[PDB]
Design a protein around this ligand. Structure first.
Ligand code: CL
Ligand code: CL
Ligand code: CL
Ligand code: CL
Length: 91
C-alpha cells in the first residue's frame, strides 16, 4: 500500500532523527504513531493501523541505517523534509 509506504517512511525518518540526529524535541513513538493514525484518518485512509505503520517503519529503519550516505547528510535531509510532519507532531 502506497499510503502505508508513505506513512511508514515518515515515521521511520522521525525515529532516525530522534535516535541518530539528536532531535530531543520530537514526541515519543506512541505519540508519533497516534499522530500518524490521526493524519491517515483525516486523509480518509481507513485501512491503516498503528501496528501496520509501526512494523513497516521498523523494516524501513533498518534499510536507512544500512544506507551508505554519510550519517550527517541523512540528518540534514530528514530535518529539512520532515518540517511539515514535525509541525503536526508538536501542534
Ligand atoms: Cl545531529
Ligand atoms: Cl490503529
Ligand atoms: Cl493498531
Ligand atoms: Cl557517516
Amino acid at each position: 500500500s502506497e499510503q502505508l509506504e508513505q506513512m511508514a517512511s515518515i515515521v521511520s525518518a522521525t525515529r532516525y532523527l530522534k535516535m541518530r540526529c539528536n532531535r530531543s524535541d520530537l514526541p515519543d513513538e506512541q505519540s508519533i504513531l497516534n499522530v500518524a493514525n490521526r493524519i491517515a484518518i483525516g486523509k480518509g485512509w481507513q485501512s491503516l493501523t498503528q501496528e501496520d505503520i509501526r512494523k513497516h517503519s521498523d523494516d524501513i529503519y533498518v534499510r536507512l541505517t544500512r544506507d551508505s550516505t554519510p550519517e550527517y547528510i541523512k540528518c540534514r535531509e530528514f530535518n529539512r523534509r520532515l518540517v511539515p510532519f514535525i509541525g503536526e507532531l508538536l501542534a
